[model samples]
Target: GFKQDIATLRGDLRTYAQDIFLAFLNKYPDEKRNFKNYVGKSDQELKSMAKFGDHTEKVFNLMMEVADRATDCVPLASDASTLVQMKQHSGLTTGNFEKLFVALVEYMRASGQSFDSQSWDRFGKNLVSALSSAGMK
Candidate 1:
């Protein structure tokens, strides 16, 4: 488990990246004129190259290293393992799986949409009904 502070930090990093992109565009609108040529390879090369290597990559690598280290000490719960076994056996159904998947997508859409709280609520309720009908509580 991740703590609330870590979750908040992740959100902050996402916001920071968005803000940086906006500021870059505002500073040089013409900078985006050549975006297509550079978007895929140029950005990646700059981050990965020798002289212009990015600190962001260093931090990301370090984070992964720490997570890998931590995993060695992580304990697996019997219930969690048993749930996988159940999925492999009989408790899982195709209808139940489909409902879980559609519900996730609808939840994501509702979360991402702005100025549509009522519509979001309606979609959420429908998702709940579909999931419950499939035997999920």
Candidate 2:
């Protein structure tokens, strides 16, 4: 059932978010500077921060919602409310989004989750389309 999938995904993402985020930052040195305020903190401390927790929860929830809707055979609308909010508030360029998408997929694989490649591809494409609709380059 979709509920089971959501629970599994949410749990896996939550457990691995910090590691994934650290990998993302390390994989993109330039992006690491974006968190300048946390420069002095150890990776463990950074992972434990409220900011990181909030971000992880938000992202996982969004993914879960997308997955749930997808299971119902409903594609995310181009102008979906969540997509619009993501574009408006994420401060990510299209290239950044692309990198994050790749990183997410890799992270899932590395975490040993039964990764759903097709659904992830669909989600990424929809996100990119939404960004394009928002005129994000």
Candidate 3:
């Protein structure tokens, strides 16, 4: 049921990432400052920026992947490595991701997407954990 719901949601990939990004910004306008140049741009200008859109798409894809494989999810070995690199490159922290995930699910339901919140809850917890414990001894 979770997979089926995710599959249906993914079918709208054409506009899904941007829609979710806008929805997130609407809910958490303060977070847009963390996104490159997103704070000052109009909706049209934001849509036209490939870098901004690409970042949104990347996280959206990651969210989908986590949800799609929630039952068999695994984290990377390199909190110690690539993930640390991701943080350096993206400045993504679990704190922000927690808000993002909630915003995403809220937007999905509001926009009439088929969503299985139970599975998404699992996915969100796991992903947030993965991002949170990303580096250490």
The best-first sequence of candidates by lDDT reads 3, 2, 1
Residue pairs in clash, model 3: 78-81
Q: What is the C-alpha lDDT of each candidate?
A: 0.36, 0.64, 0.66
Taking the tens digit of each residue's C-alpha lDDT, what string does model 2 give over 24-115? 67677677555665576677888778987778667667766766776342346643445646643466566776666677667766765576
Give a tens-digit lDDT track for model 1, residues 1-137: 22332333344443332333333434444544534333444444544544323433343243223323332222123322332344422454334433333443343344432323343234334434444454453
Model 1: residues >4 Å from true position, as ranges?
A: 1-84, 87-89, 113-137
Among these predictions, the greatest lDDT belongs to 3
Against the true structure, candidate 2 has what lDDT?
0.64
**CA deviation > 4 Å runs, candidate 3:** 72-84, 87-90
Better of 1 and 3 by TM-score: 3
Worst-scoring 10-residue span by lDDT in model 2: 71-80
Q: What are the RMSDs of all candidates, in order?
A: 19.7, 3.4, 3.2
Task: Show where candidate 2 strays beyond 4 Å.
Answer: 1-5, 71-75, 78-81, 85-90
